[PDB]
Ligand binder design. Sequence first.
Ligand SMILES: [Zn+2]
Ligand SMILES: [Zn+2]
Ligand SMILES: [Zn+2]
Ligand SMILES: [Zn+2]
Lengths: 360, 360, 362, 362
Amino acid sequence: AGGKVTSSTGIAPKRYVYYPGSEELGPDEIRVIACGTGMPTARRAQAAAAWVVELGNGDKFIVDIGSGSMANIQSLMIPANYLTKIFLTHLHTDHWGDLVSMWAGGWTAGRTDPLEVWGPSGSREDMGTKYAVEHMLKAYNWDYMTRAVTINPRPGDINVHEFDYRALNEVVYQENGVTFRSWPCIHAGDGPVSFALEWNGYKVVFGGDTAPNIWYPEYAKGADLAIHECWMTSDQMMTKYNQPAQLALRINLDFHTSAQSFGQIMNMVQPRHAVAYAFFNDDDTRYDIYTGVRENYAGPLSMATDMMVWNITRDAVTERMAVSPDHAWDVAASEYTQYILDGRLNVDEANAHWKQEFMG
Amino acid sequence: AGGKVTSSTGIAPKRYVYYPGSEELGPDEIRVIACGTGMPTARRAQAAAAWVVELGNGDKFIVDIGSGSMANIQSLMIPANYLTKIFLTHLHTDHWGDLVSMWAGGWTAGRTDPLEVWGPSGSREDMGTKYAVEHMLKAYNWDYMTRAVTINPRPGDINVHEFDYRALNEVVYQENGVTFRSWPCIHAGDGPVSFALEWNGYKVVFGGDTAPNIWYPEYAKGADLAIHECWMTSDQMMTKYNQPAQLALRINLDFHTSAQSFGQIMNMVQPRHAVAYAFFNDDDTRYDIYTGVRENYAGPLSMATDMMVWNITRDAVTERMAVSPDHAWDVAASEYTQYILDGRLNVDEANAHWKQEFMG
Amino acid sequence: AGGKVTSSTGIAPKRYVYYPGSEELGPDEIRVIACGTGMPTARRAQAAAAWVVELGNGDKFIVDIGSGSMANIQSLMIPANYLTKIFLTHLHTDHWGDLVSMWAGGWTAGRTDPLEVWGPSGSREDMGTKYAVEHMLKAYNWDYMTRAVTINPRPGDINVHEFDYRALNEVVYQENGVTFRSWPCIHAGDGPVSFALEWNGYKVVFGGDTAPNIWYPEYAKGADLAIHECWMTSDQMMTKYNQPAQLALRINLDFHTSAQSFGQIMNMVQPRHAVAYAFFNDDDTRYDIYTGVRENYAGPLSMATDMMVWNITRDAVTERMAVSPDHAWDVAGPASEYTQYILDGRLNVDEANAHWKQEFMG
Amino acid sequence: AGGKVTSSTGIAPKRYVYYPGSEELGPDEIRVIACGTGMPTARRAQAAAAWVVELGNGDKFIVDIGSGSMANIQSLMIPANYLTKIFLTHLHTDHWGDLVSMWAGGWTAGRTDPLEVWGPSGSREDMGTKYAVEHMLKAYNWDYMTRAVTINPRPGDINVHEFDYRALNEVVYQENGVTFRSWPCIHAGDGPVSFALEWNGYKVVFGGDTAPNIWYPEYAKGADLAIHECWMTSDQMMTKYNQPAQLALRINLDFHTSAQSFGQIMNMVQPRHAVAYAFFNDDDTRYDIYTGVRENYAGPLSMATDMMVWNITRDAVTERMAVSPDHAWDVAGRASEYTQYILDGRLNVDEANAHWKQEFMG
Ligand SMILES: [Zn+2]
Ligand SMILES: [Zn+2]
Ligand SMILES: [Zn+2]
Ligand SMILES: [Zn+2]
């Protein structure tokens, strides 16, 4: 598997796995990494929704930054200041829970520019991204004010770009040859969108969460990579949750996109490559989910899980797994009263040994 | 290792690893699980500070709940209803980032009681935990209101119980024979505290984060299990961050508790079992930190990483590693406008087959 | 998922994962654990073929024990002396390379009984299981003789029970309620067999490796659990090994059982539960294979991977995943070969060991 | 950590982890990977002893290839044809258990040369490497004879280079400016050795298994990288095994090199970098072993676990961890043994396979 090795001391070419930080990105290539793929229950195997997109022009975007996804995003060996632009499909903790982590960790990790967040409005002020993010910064006001005494507060700003959720396939971002469009989703309440990324003849669709809708099939048409919610089966709902027959059946019709509905949508969409995500990707769930899609869609399919990567080139959309470090590292008025400062323990004795040795 | 197997068809007793959900807890026993141990930066290997405490009387506590920890907590096979009481040491993202996941996750996962949070105050209203939590709920208003359409709101609420950060060893909690005390830390700015749980002759101390202070040694004295911050070497600061000598030296004296200061501190306390946490616990970092602690302390010492467990009994404080599921599961006015509900797609034909088989 | 918790202090019943050593086995119950499932190349995610069978009467059997599988077997918290009976389908290293590790490791782990091995003959002495084990013990003569000096050598013996590979469903083991029968496979050359284990109304079938054959569908009929070979697609063969199309086609027709053939077989067999194994179980292989299978078979299916487990009860065959320790340890159950030339090289380390020795001796 | 990233679209330089297959090896550089580091009992976290050595002149070696290590070796994306030369310290299953897997595996993975094995003689013919490998090939005769019907048999040969175990720091190998030398160990019975590899101004020492001896401290002197056995404490022996106090004591003195002894040895050697291995590398074991060493040795020190790697340059010896695929694959670089009796048993599967077959053929 992978490219043929041509020398003892050389580099293995077109490696069968993606090692993050190890591969040059071509000027007509997109890299998409799933840094989170699993619904609202927390689990080490699948963080909540998060996508990192690297474009051959040097631009990088995050779409969704769900609870737990930062551990994956930090494993990519991308400097913080290259990852400042974040698009939110909607305000479920499982789609922006780890914004606080990117904001706080990313700042310690050496980001020098503000975060730029694009997110939907809701049906009223207090149901949109602008309200949400302003209250998140106040929530973490003790973190912000204590950090800023010692680090210039510029990287701690969040420039929110709130776009109308109601808009049908309109531009929300246009810069340096890159366009994002939003259209609505049907999910929990008014606000959630899907995004389409267009650049250099490539189209990547980030479906977010939704029950099936008439917009995604129309506006996602002929995507290189189409990502859509794809729910576990009703049988699995009963087995895993103790759900009645009634509630279990209702969930795959009104609340979530069934695997079979996902099939229908990708049959309509005709993408180069479809990606099902949101479900628990386990040895006893994945197969009946896959069979559901296959009733209705026959074309190229990935069943998303954490750290799956797609390379989009003119000739191919190639699925691989990313092999990254679990033991990840970053790659490159006082708020104290005299009362607290007075409580410092003397430790000059215990430290004098290591201390003298280090200063030569 | 472990106890002697006695039958072919039996159960291994006194197992050398802790399997969460597999062991009855004794009426005179405590269980502490590190659900996060590793600070500023995210990494799959170490979530941010979180501690689960199980008492033999049946009360369960969480002390800190940092970004990432929810995936560890959910691998314990504990129902949502039994984890409702959370204690924060401070308002750093890496000690309450996942409170939102516990909040939103537990509520979709059958929890029937609100969360209860105890955390300190700051030098002023916008620097304490009552401000923090109020603004977190506003930040997640879209999630709050959308969820409340389909699930009684009472679990969504968060009874906060702010207490003065300046107090020197004062009860902040007392129900069902359990007592928590707090006292100050010297960390980033005014507000951060350490806790001491006293129950049924047992004392467990959670140091949160701090530079070495005079209150910890005095109020921690004779704990069964004593947890305190312990940091990377100055040499490791220079190698991992390219910090110059001056800044590297000073971070181990002014800003954080050195390995050697950790030792001095635990010598004064003389606990049954000391725990060092907060450092990145890697094959090249951990070793020199242990040689630091052992310059000044010779009693029983754990170097925490995630899913490390302590059984506190009358006889012993015993460290094991927990071996828990990566593929974890939960164990047991509308906010839509007609503009959105008008976009629902017809999937009836796509879904007819599985529907018909599922009804028979 | 799993059973409802009904106390803060208590045990979570009927767990959604198997924690090895944590569950009582019922008298009318079988536990089968996959301790390897993977093709002829090594990888940490899949050891080479290995099955542990636990019967409710307290009998335990290893069927196949390929390279890598011992790390999985040793994670089950089963004492070495309970795992003394081993059945080999065939003499590929991926089916018995770890017998050496069970022999040596299991002994230091506290086996006190000799190992017992059942395996086919071949077309001549030197192609059979007796020859192979006999010469495996000679290969490890240095380990054996050095170990045996001061110790009872009884646990180092391997008693081989060789049986005629050509026999059509004949008994090869009959002890304490338990029957094993074997029948041929078609695979590399004469010798490889499949096994049926019959006990207390249950029938577990271990296919080993084969091209599709007329025996397996006859003698596996009605198995509670039927394990059979199932191969990567020809397309996967061309992607992963740059096979020309001609050879890739033939690999799935002549040498191995295809997913579609596997489907034809389990349709014919009609078990309570079919297991597919012996393929690399990856995010980009597994789906095409499940599809191939479902063309022809509609009944309960497991796609095996390392540490998958089935509970066979009267009422269900239940698949779970085992969650076991990676930092495993053995669990307890109930003429010198030195010259003076080598022993005169011992380094004086009294000084260096003084401090720890004194503390330890009180 | 790591080199400064200079470009959005470019490669992270001097990565803080080693991704096997992602780095050019310099002409005056050595890379050493631990592919097994673990005690005598099997576990997923730690294979039995195996070291992969890559030199900047293109030569590659394996020193030891204990049970389980092939999974780690196969994760390095090194073609089978570059990994044909194997050095064994001694004939414990934990130091050559996976020779069979490399032999069979690398032959299907496409090796086109014979394996070349260097190993020690014993006090008599049946205690040496030549006798061991001979009987290993007879053991796996069914695998060899069946494989040889469809693949050229040349790469199925193992050329054994047996060397005098008794020799004191003599050459066992000299080729292309690369030397290996051997000297005795004190371990189980006569036969075990340590190696030193000398090339282009560099010296790398592979200790094997030994109680403290007078030869390692003398011949390992001034090594760039010095590897030596280093055991778990007597307290840990008592806890993990329930050894009675006096047995636990003797194990750290007569049978195995204690942490303190290792310290004395490395204090005498003065290597650029020392490596302790063979102990179960756990949260409740590793720290007291490290303490023990630091009683007697203060220089640079690695506590080996699986997939740790050392880069050796003129400037430095750098420890990192290797991050490699669990889901590994190969990377590319006579009479039949069937009787008609077996071949007559083929199943008709023409119908089940017609659909995929027609589609695949265009
Ligand atoms: Zn959502
Ligand atoms: Zn803090
Ligand atoms: Zn075979
Ligand atoms: Zn040995």
